[PDB]
Amino acid sequence: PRQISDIKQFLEIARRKDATSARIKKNTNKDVKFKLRCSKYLYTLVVADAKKAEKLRQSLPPDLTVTEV
Amino acid sequence: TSAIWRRLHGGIVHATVSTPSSIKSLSWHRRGDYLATSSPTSSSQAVLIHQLSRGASQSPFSKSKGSVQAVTFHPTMPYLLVATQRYVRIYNLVKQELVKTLLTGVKWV
Amino acid sequence: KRTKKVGVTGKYGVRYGASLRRDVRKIEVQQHSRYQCPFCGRNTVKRTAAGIWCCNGKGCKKVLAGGAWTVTTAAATSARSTIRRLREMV
Amino acid sequence: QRVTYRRRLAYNTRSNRTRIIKTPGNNIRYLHIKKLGTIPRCGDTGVPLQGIPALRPREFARLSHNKKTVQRAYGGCLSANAVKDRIVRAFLIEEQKIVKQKLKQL
Amino acid sequence: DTINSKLALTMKSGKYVLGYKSTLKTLRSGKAKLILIAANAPPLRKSELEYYAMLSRCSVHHYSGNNIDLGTACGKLFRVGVLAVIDAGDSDILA
Amino acid sequence: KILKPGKVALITRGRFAGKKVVILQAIDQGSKSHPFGHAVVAGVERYPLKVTKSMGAKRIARRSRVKPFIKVVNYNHLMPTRYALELDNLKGLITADTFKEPTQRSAARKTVKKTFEEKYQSGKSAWFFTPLRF
RNA sequence: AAUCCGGUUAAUAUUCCGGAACCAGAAGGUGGAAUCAACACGGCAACGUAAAUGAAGUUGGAGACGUCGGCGGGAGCCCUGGGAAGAGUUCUCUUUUCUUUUUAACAAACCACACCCUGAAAUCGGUUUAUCCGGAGCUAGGGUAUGGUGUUUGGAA
Numbered sequence: 001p002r003q004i005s006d007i008k009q010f011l012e013i014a015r016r017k018d019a020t021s022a023r024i025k026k027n028t029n030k031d032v033k034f035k036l037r038c039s040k041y042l043y044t045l046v047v048a049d050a051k052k053a054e055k056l057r058q059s060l061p062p063d064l065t066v067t068e069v
Numbered sequence: 070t071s072a073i074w075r076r077l078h079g080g081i082v083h084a085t086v087s088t089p090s091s092i093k094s095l096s097w098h099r100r101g102d103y104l105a106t107s108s109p110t111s112s113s114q115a116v117l118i119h120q121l122s123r124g125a126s127q128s129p130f131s132k133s134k135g136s137v138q139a140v141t142f143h144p145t146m147p148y149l150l151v152a153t154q155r156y157v158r159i160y161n162l163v164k165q166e167l168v169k170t171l172l173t174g175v176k177w178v
Numbered sequence: 179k180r181t182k183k184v185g186v187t188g189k190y191g192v193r194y195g196a197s198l199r200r201d202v203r204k205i206e207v208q209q210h211s212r213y214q215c216p217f218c219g220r221n222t223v224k225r226t227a228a229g230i231w232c233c234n235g236k237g238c239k240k241v242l243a244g245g246a247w248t249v250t251t252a253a254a255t256s257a258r259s260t261i262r263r264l265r266e267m268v
Numbered sequence: 269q270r271v272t273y274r275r276r277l278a279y280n281t282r283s284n285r286t287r288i289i290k291t292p293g294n295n296i297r298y299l300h301i302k303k304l305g306t307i308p309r310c311g312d313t314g315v316p317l318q319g320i321p322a323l324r325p326r327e328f329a330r331l332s333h334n335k336k337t338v339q340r341a342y343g344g345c346l347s348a349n350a351v352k353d354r355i356v357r358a359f360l361i362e363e364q365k366i367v368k369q370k371l372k373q374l
Numbered sequence: 375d376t377i378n379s380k381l382a383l384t385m386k387s388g389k390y391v392l393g394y395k396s397t398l399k400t401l402r403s404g405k406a407k408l409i410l411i412a413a414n415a416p417p418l419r420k421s422e423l424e425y426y427a428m429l430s431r432c433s434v435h436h437y438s439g440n441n442i443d444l445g446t447a448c449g450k451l452f453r454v455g456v457l458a459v460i461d462a463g464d465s466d467i468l469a
Numbered sequence: 470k471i472l473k474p475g476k477v478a479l480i481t482r483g484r485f486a487g488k489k490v491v492i493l494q495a496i497d498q499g500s501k502s503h504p505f506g507h508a509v510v511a512g513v514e515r516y517p518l519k520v521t522k523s524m525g526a527k528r529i530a531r532r533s534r535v536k537p538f539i540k541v542v543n544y545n546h547l548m549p550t551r552y553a554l555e556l557d558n559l560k561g562l563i564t565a566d567t568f569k570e571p572t573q574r575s576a577a578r579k580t581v582k583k584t585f586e587e588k589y590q591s592g593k594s595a596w597f598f599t600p601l602r603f
Numbered sequence: 604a605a606u607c608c609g610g611u612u613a614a615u616a617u618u619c620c621g622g623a624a625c626c627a628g629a630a631g632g633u634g635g636a637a638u639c640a641a642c643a644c645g646g647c648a649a650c651g652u653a654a655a656u657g658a659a660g661u662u663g664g665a666g667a668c669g670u671c672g673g674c675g676g677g678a679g680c681c682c683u684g685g686g687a688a689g690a691g692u693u694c695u696c697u698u699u700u701c702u703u704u705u706u707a708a709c710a711a712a713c714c715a716c717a718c719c720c721u722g723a724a725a726u727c728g729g730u731u732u733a734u735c736c737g738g739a740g741c742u743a744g745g746g747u748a749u750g751g752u753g754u755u756u757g758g759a760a
Contacts, residue, residue, distance in 0.1 A: 041624090043757095214442075275617090289707060290705065299752090307749070340483070352481040355479060355487045359479055360425060453739090483649095542648090
């Protein structure tokens, strides 16, 4: 698995056709994990900020399959 | 009113700062309290941070990799941007660590 | 000084006879003693195998063909002198 | 907790190397590991080369060229001191043979 | 034996450097006049020093003893493979 | 004083090991940036290939092209050599200011390249342009 | 050459299931890099960098190696001080007795005997449990390399 530290990188990989699905994981420390299943790697972005979390979630392309915890 | 401080046609000089090497780049903090001075020749002490309020100079880096070409201060945060020969490294000064490294893909910055 | 006569052959205990342990004592002292390197002057030549004397000195690392228990033998020294004499008269 | 071999090879050999791990299920288990890699030796002095990792022979094929070499003459084949001795000895003996050629041509 | 005596007088009167790197600096700067090389010196090192000396027109002497003997002749308690004489002072080893 | 501006030498340490260089200017005293006896040199990074009576002028010129380099080198890493190479085009063009100024570094490198072109074509210092086989 | 964890059957699992990787081979594609100064730059150097054409021929390395002895590092285990969940004991005593407190391959970043640089050492110093080392350059100072069964995060709660 790969960790992505850049939000726009996460969007770019999500835009790429190899992206298959996305998971949003809400942890007990109010930190969210945006995980993106690609052909080769599970790309994970750890967003500790709430406001950046849902603007990213609405930033995700509508065609992509986003799934709850 | 590291680097040593010392206190003419209107030469109103205030505080001369002497450094081991020839400083190449100068940067100012937003609050005017920190001065960043960089020299490419040196290594251990290539860049020096000067606190005017304390009237002191120090080297915020224990070990430096690559010759430092330039330096500047982040405009929303105290982070220091160090432009080395090939990389650009982001340093958080309050916690004294390395945030990000930019791979410029450049032979000389 | 812990042993009076046996020395290095004290590791053999009381066995094999006094004379045989005596002959081994001469040879084992020769076999294990450190020798001055003819190439780097350091006292760094030690025996790897019978007839092979290697120097552990940094930068020299020379390996020598020599005697079984000593770096140089009397027969080799004597004949080297004669061979030098023969080449000079030729 | 006791462990077992993960393979049908008993007899701890130089190829049956194992390691103890704690699994996320709270289990003590063996992981079978390979023999350690080797830094390439120098061709003249025989010492390990500086700047190259310690991989297995087939494992070297996955590195890029710069990771398997040093940017110098004979880089990845000879050490720095070995190369320097090659350079000096080559130049000096060429100078010697030039002098001998000058002496013998007359 | 006379060369040993001249060396001993040189180290009490004149100026010198003892060792490979100090020798190379003196040859490079041209201040070296005469060069002692031990008999057991590496053949590559001797030829390199001889090339240095003929570039800087310095005399070369190949000391008959090894570096241990050269160090003893120097009066110091370490073996010396090569030295450079810049001035002999009262001694006349240069000629 | 065997290392003078205009003396041919060999480099034994670094990337350009075994290459023949000409001492452009010696800083035997040393410098603050280089606290040792360094000397700036210009050398041949890629030696020109051998040429023959045959082959057209295109191929001969293609094989006669030379790639130079300029570098500050320690004395202990340089091996001095009896041959000497001199030309007024390469006197005083290099300095510390040239190394700090990268455009001047590239300009000096190109000037050294061109100067080596006329020198090779004119057939001078054939030994200097012959690679050393070690 | 290259696979791990959890789960699953009445009986099979590194093989199935879920999740997460990896190897080799093949083709062209996309993005970047070199090139009209043809085949990249930086570092005094050890050498570094995401790239950075190399045929025939030759050469080198790895593969690839005994046995014994102590020394040092890591991992698991053992041990242990608190916290939290249940459980045993409780005539009396015991802020306690016990159990559960877990984190894989893989991915990224990080991390000092050899080597380099300056400097020249006897009132000789450095140094191991074990006396080796130094004018063939010690000590000291600053660097380079090696780099997980280490740390931090992803996997992953």
